[PDB]
Amino acid sequence: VSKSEIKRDAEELKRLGAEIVDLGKNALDKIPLDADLRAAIELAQRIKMEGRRRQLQLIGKMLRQRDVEPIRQALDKLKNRHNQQVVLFHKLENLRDRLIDQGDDAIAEVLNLWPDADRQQLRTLIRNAKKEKEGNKPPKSARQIFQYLRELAENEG
Amino acid sequence: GIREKIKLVSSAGTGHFYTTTKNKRTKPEKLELKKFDPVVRQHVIYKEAK
RNA sequence: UUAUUAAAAACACAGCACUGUGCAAACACGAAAGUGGACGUAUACGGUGUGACGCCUGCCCGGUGCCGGAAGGUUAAUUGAUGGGGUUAGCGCAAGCGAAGCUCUUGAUCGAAGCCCCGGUAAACGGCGGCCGUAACUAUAACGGUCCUAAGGUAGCGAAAUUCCUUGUCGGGUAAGUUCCGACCUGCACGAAUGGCGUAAUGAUGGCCAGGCUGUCUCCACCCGAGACUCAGUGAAAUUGAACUCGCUGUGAAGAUGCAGUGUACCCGCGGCAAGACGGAAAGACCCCGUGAACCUUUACUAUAGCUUGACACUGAACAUUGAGCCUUGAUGUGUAGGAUAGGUGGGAGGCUUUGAAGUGUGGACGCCAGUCUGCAUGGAGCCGACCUUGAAAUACCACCCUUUAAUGUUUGAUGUUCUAACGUUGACCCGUAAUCCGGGUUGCGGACAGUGUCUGGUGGGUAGUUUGACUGGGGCGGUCUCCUCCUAAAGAGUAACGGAGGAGCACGAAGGUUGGCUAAUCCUGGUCGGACAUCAGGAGGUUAGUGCAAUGGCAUAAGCCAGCUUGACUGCGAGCGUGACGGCGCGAGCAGGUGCGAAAGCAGGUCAUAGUGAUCCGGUGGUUCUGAAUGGAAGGGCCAUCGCUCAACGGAUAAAAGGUACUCCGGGGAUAACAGGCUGAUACCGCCCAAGAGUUCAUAUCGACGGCGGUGUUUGGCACCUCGAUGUCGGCUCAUCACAUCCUGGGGCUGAAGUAGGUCCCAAGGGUAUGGCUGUUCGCCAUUUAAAGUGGUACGCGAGCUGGGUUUAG
RNA sequence: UGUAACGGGGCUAAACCAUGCACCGAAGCUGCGGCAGCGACGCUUAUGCGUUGUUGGGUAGGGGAGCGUUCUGUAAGCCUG
RNA sequence: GCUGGUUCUCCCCGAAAGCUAUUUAGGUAGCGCCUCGUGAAUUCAUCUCCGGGGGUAGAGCACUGUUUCGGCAAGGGGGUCACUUACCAACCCGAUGCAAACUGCGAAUACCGGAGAAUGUUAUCACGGGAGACACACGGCGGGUGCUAACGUCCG
RNA sequence: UACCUUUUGUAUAAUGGGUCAGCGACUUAUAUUCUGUAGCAAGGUUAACCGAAUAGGGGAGCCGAAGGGAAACCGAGUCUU
RNA sequence: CUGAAUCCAUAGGUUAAUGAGGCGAACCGGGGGAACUGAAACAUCUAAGUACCCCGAGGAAAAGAAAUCAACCGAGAUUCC
RNA sequence: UGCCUGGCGGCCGUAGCGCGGUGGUCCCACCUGACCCCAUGCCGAACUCAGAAGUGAAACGCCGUAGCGCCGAUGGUAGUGUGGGGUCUCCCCAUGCGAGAGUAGGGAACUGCCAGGCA
């Protein structure tokens, strides 16, 4: 509706692209980014400062022509700034004590709602979780419980 | 924007390629097009249209 | 307290509250020593908020700040396993491959803080609002139904800060009170330590009233002294282009002593008043500009001081616990019906076993004792699987294996305990030494901690350097900058405006080329579901239809429509022309090669055309032995094609930048606003004409609807001209002047004028044309008189006459 | 502010309409004299004339040709109590 | 990148306040324009004739819009339990207008080129040196905006 | 109806000067382009330095007589194919 | 020559001989070190290791004898034009 | 070389549209027989065939018809270049160029080459 209205909208997308290049390689693969865009990211930091502007012009160019919300939404989870991400972790730890203290009454909800949960391994993990807590041993396996639930949270496959 | 720029490489062993644009969304099939190649001084097929 | 315009309601104040601080205290001054705090010790010191006293300080942890907790995700320095490249001893009669060493590069594992996350913290920063409908305007202002908020104002005090009409209107104060005082209400915002209510006393504090008092005033008069005046003596000043320096009308860079016309005026002093010389004193302080400067702000940029985490060194000796990878070593997987502690991916109706078995027992051991594995011999010849059921069928076996975990060896972390010999000691004691410095020695206490040095992660307007482009708009924000179409555009081309209409940042491998073929809108008749199209049979129309999209110009040889083949949307070019200052852009016959179409003549270097775009620098890829800082390579560089811009500020100042300054400054500008002055009459005021209608008959005796023509123009406005090296306001006092569109007096006309009293119009400017409360007032209201208490110009007169009440820089 | 809507006096034509003949009227033109630039022919050649016609307002600006002062060589020359 | 001043004389020539671009709009670079120097063709200007395309003035309503009058009128509205009405009217026809974004028509001038007699100090073009300027105002003509309101703005 | 500056536009009441006398402003250096002038000429010319000290020596070096391409390279020819 | 903590020895104290203390215009080396300005702004940079401050001696100072260059031929200190 | 027909051109309505008449030995258009040569997103109307039995119905050519379309004067008028003037939002004067529309009128085509048939 206004040429300058598009301008600030496009410029806002430009600084978003400048945030992707300023993000580490290990966390770069987390976002569902296409290979064509991904390949342009690695060349962006290794190019000289003036070429970064051209690369920033590149990154903005084919990022506007496609959908942006899933990329922005996925980036928000990694930054842990989207509201649904932090509450998801709240319920993820809310089912820990619901499961680590009983071990039988909490598995029903997980299997009924999530069909990719390996109940063969989950029961054994709770067996170790009960053993370490009862024997007042350091929680060397409690961390792995959260990783498995977190991994299955976003379709581990 | 929606269009994706593509490169057409000669089916022969030469590395000479041509530049063009095709909409992948509507035409995802690879092109079967032949065009003149100066290095071989003949007409050669071009493929691998992204 | 603002020396030298603000003495206050501002600051401070004892008190109150919160927070930080255990002594080598926090903090500050200082690269550090050291000092202050304090030679004090939580009843002490520092910081912050409020500010006697009395009643009290209600709700909310959402964001920021603070504390604690850490479960988890992200995260640098640090260390160097793979992968690739270069070089070559050699292997190759060569193309090539390639041992070791060295080198360059991607970078697995270790990696904390920090960020988030949780609970508190509001006498921390802060917040306490809506939408629908009810009364209550009861003695005190509190009740329902909802939002996406964490929460909707407790008491206190109401005329408050939005809200308006009849200054809000009643009463005091006054004859008359836009100020003052308690109150009606249609009022609830503030608002409870950025404190709320009341508060005696206090104050050169704001406003109002009353009593005595007076030249403050009607209305000034006289007198006493110092100037002002004359004489004698001494003797400045700012300013000054030159002057032999009049009034009036008009012109003129627009307010004329100097111009044009005309009138007046003997020459020259002195004492005065100040209307003018856009007077004098300052290169305005009011507005604009500068790719000017300086301060301030931040979730603007790049940085940093400082704070903080980790690694490395100072920095050590004895251990104990234990987290992580790696090598086999055997088990290990209880949702359910089910012989029953079923792991996923393929083969699978059999492998194994007298190189001695089903099934009975202990030992060790897994272990949710529900169950299972196993050395041993006893034992002396054997076990399954679709079986029906399970989502899924096997300890019938053969493998990649995942998780949990058992026991050695390897590597590296983390935690805890002991000690002293590093290091610290603003602990004691002794000496230099008749010394609260310092050093040396003993001992005690910590102790490889703290702290320090380099790098690194985080915080970091506390500090430093900058940016915030041009066009005009306003309480805060926005829009435009490139290209294309028609008109404006005045018949070559081109031609601007805040001139009127718009579109583009694509798309098409067919929607291009060739060849062949065909020609619609709209309407008539007929025709079935079927209607205003379904497709049509017959007809006037040869394009008013269509031409991917906005518009225009074209399109029948069709460029419009359909089908076959198709890549000429090709490579190197390209004489020549046009457009622009140029970069650039467009057309382009024709040549060489290889192609597609049709038989051939020929067409095809994209789309009917005009917008669909980006020059250079610097990056990726391929080729080029083009070059290769001793030789051969290599690295690197060059050339060509190629993808590489919201470089959109689109001829593209940085790869990297937002705002304010009434605390501002500097250099310029009437290159640019406001008030006034001369154009102007959109709106509105004044006059006249046209005259249907209402008017006892009777249009202009008196109005008069729908319209038109003129004039100051004092409201509401816009245009070029400026005094920014200065054009001082609003109002009041003194002073007045001019025109009459006359308020009175004067002379009349008409009258629906009996007289007085009246109403309208004409002539007439000689004179006169008010006193007080309110508010700074102009104006206006009110009180009370007369003949009235006139209308306008005087730059809406008058500060080189006064006033500073409004406007009023600095608090 | 003062006649102020012919510049004034003033004009019944000294206003207006149509014609004719004259005059005044600028630095315009012509006459005389003088200077300078510009081409060309003939006198002839470092060049001026019998000439020839023409040109000669001018800011920013450009081109050309000169005057004046100090000092140096000229200059132990010259003027000079 | 601003303001101010830039000092002796003579002669000759002598424009602009425009275009493009500019973190540019009071500055700057190229061009437009000026001066000097070199070279070059009847080079260029004036006029006559010839060969040219307009869509401007004007005019018109075939095409694109607006709109009036009269005639024929499909149909819409009500009533009568096929008829009618003091309601409205599509379309066509004849006439009348207007239009920058309409032209079945269409000038004068302007512009391009060729030929020619005469005149014009080559006044024409190419290159080189040096500039200045890029704030224009008014009047006439044809326009946009404004009320053809303006000592109004922007155009040729 | 003065001068200077500013501007389209000034005596303008837009700026500056009270007067006189003196002082006061496009210079200098190093490179680069063009013109005039002088020498030499397919050659021109020396720096530093020595020095009989502006002489002479000194040809170190620079420019040009051949250019084309980025370059290897080619050559009165050169780059693209 | 004396001389503690601590026996030896030290730290320290006294006496004696030698050199310096400060000033100075420029030059040298070193230790610190900006901005105005240019890029038409500005952060890389230039400005510039300049101005400025301090230290040491000098008449000069610094540097001075190759772990230097060059390229398969080769020069054999440093310094300056 | 005289008449008729057909093809390829000159010019593009004085070149056409409409109405009536005329033509089949010859030149033209419908109409017949349909294994094939040419190929479909759908048959031999309409484009490709091996045949002359019929007809000039439609079309085409020719002639007349001025109903329409079209061309088009002369004069007049609007407009305009140049210079001057006016009571200057617009006009006039001297001269030059000269509209559109309308009227009279014209107009039922002309022409080149070749082939065939009748004299």
UniProtKB/Swiss-Prot annotation, chain A:
Main function: Member of a network of 50S ribosomal subunit biogenesis factors (ObgE, RluD, RsfS and DarP) which assembles along the 30S-50S interface, preventing incorrect 23S rRNA structures from forming. Promotes peptidyl transferase center (PTC) maturation. Binds pre-50S ribosomal subunits near the 23S rRNA L1 stalk, where it may mediate correct positioning of the L1 stalk.
Subunit structure: Interacts with RluD in late stage pre-50S ribosomal subunits. Interacts with ribosomal protein uL16 (rlpP), via the N-terminal loop of this protein.
Pfam families given in the database record: DarP (PF04751)
Family: Belongs to the DarP family.
Entry keyword annotation includes 4Fe-4S: no
Name used for this protein in its record: Dual-action ribosomal maturation protein DarP
GO BP field: assembly of large subunit precursor of preribosome
Region feature Not required for functional ribosome assembly, mapped onto this chain: 85-157
Subcellular location as annotated: Cytoplasm
InterPro entries attached to this UniProt entry: DarP, DarP_sf
Reported phenotype of the disruption mutant: Slow growth at 16 degrees Celsius, accumulates a pre-50S ribosomal assembly particle, although some mature 50S subunits are formed. Ribosomal proteins uL16, bL33, bL35 and bL36 are missing while 23S rRNA helices H38, the L1 stalk and H89 (part of the peptidyl transferase center) are incorrectly positioned.
Domain remark text: Has several regions, N-terminal loop (residues 1-25), a central domain (residues 26-105), joined by linker (residues 105-116) to the C-terminal domain (residues 117-183). The C-terminal domain is not required for function, while the N-terminal loop is; shortening the linker decreases assembly.
Transmembrane segment boundaries: none
Superkingdom, taxonomy of origin: Bacteria
Predominant cellular place of this UniProt entry's protein: cytoplasm
Keyword entries, A-Z: Cytoplasm, Ribosome biogenesis, RNA-binding, rRNA-binding
Gene Ontology cellular component list: cytosol
GO molecular function, one term: ribosomal large subunit binding
From Swiss-Prot, chain B:
Pfam families attached to this UniProt entry: Ribosomal_L33
The encoding gene: rpmG
Organism: Escherichia coli (strain K12)
Stored HAMAP family: Ribosomal_bL33
Record GO biological process: cytoplasmic translation; response to antibiotic; ribosomal large subunit assembly
PANTHER family, A to Z: 54S RIBOSOMAL PROTEIN L39, MITOCHONDRIAL, LARGE RIBOSOMAL SUBUNIT PROTEIN BL33M
Lineage: Bacteria, Pseudomonadati, Pseudomonadota, Gammaproteobacteria, Enterobacterales
Family note: Belongs to the bacterial ribosomal protein bL33 family.
Miscellaneous comment as given in the Swiss-Prot or TrEMBL entry: Surface exposed on the 50S subunit.
Protein name according to UniProt: Large ribosomal subunit protein bL33
Keyword Translocase among UniProt keywords: no
Keyword entries, A-Z: Methylation, Ribonucleoprotein, Ribosomal protein, RNA-binding, tRNA-binding
Single GO molecular function: tRNA binding
